[PDB]
Amino acid sequence: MAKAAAIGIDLGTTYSCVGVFQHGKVEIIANDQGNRTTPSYVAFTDTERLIGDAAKNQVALNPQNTVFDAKRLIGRKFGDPVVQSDMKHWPFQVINDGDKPKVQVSYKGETKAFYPEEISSMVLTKMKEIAEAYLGYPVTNAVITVPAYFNDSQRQATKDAGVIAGLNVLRIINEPTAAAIAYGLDRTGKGERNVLIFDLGGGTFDVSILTIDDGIFEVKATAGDTHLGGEDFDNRLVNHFVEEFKRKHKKDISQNKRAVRRLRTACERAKRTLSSSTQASLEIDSLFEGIDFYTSITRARFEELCSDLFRSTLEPVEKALRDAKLDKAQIHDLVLVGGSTRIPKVQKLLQDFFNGRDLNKSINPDEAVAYGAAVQAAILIKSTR
Numbered sequence: 001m002a003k004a005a006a007i008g009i010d011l012g013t014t015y016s017c018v019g020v021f022q023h024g025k026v027e028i029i030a031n032d033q034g035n036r037t038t039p040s041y042v043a044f045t046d047t048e049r050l051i052g053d054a055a056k057n058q059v060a061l062n063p064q065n066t067v068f069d070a071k072r073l074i075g076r077k078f079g080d081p082v083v084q085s086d087m088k089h090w091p092f093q094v095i096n097d098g099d100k101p102k103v104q105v106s107y108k109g110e111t112k113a114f115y116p117e118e119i120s121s122m123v124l125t126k127m128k129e130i131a132e133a134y135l136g137y138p139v140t141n142a143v144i145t146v147p148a149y150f151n152d153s154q155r156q157a158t159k160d161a162g163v164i165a166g167l168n169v170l171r172i173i174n175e176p177t178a179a180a181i182a183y184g185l186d187r188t189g190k191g192e193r194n195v196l197i198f199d200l201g202g203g204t205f206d207v208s209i210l211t212i213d214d215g216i217f218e219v220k221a222t223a224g225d226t227h228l229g230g231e232d233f234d235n236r237l238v239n240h241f242v243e244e245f246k247r248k249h250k251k252d253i254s255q256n257k258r259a260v261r262r263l264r265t266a267c268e269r270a271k272r273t274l275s276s277s278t279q280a281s282l283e284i285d286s287l288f289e290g291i292d293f294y295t296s297i298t299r300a301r302f303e304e305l306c307s308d309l310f311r312s313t314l315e316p317v318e319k320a321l322r323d324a325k326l327d328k329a330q331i332h333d334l335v336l337v338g339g340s341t342r343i344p345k346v347q348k349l350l351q352d353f354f355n356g357r358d359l360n361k362s363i364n365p366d367e368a369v370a371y372g373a374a375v376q377a378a379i380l381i382k383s384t385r
């Protein structure tokens, strides 16, 4: 029953996703708000702890006590220059507990501090309860994914997050490996298979090159930008609309925190529409000083606004190829991961770089990692018996 069942969890920087392999198919499990992915956010309020959508939904009202980006801290020492650099951009406090970072917040009127694995365990507990509500029984066996570049300390702290969350961690697997499993790229028989995974998420960009030799995975190269993602494209749309509002009304809205956040969420929404329509409409009632902001933008203008950022995704692709010592024609498969890979211009740039090659994109790119983890969790629990 529950003991013969296992889930796959993609514990993402900005969003998490959970899947289960049963009756010959992967089911990506929708949360209680009907969403197939859940924000990796934990909010501490005057009455409760919120996780996911409810936590992300109140971030503007409670920024000091809304934790996100715990994955950027997990398994790291406080003195790590990555931690010191990132801390300057977070509205929540990060403290030092014997060279270990802790996020410090106000919860039920009291000061509390949490290790990154404790924050990540609250996200994992939510994914576990989402799976349990779908299945009708508690599932505790899980495969959890991590970036291919995570070291032993980051992998161990992720497993520790799983244990705190009440999960039996069958294995910690690499995200690009789970994505290659999702497409069955490890079951093509004999001979070395070179796979490139292009993973453009909400806040990070990762390029991974793997060689699959008779089911055995080997990481040949990892490249990318830890501070490039979908939110930079949302921000480019924001600056455009701030300048358009100034041209139409001779008013600068950039200082009105509420106006900027409402514009930001509307921009994120319009950006998604632009992946399947050649235009998107913004409909913001009383954006600033009672002025409605009803406008539109073409996909062509959006592509211009992010042109330099889309083009910059090809430098880590070339860098990974040189590190792996492979030419483009030596790559057998191209896999898309991350919601931002749905952007048609991004697909076109990657396909043209690989000389007109087909892309593996039939699985929801924001779900491919949880999909593969779910497949691996099923194989692993079946071998355990």
Ligand SMILES: Nc1ncnc2c1nc(Cl)n2[C@@H]1O[C@H](CO)[C@@H](O)[C@H]1O
Pocket: 015, 200, 201, 202, 203, 229, 230, 231, 268, 271, 272, 273, 275, 338, 339, 340, 341, 342, 343, 366
């Ligand atoms: N249809 C889409 N077109 C463009 N961007 C998208 C799309 N879906 C998602 Cl999710 N994202 C973005 O992916 C990230 C999460 O993986 C977020 O930045 C989200 O906006």
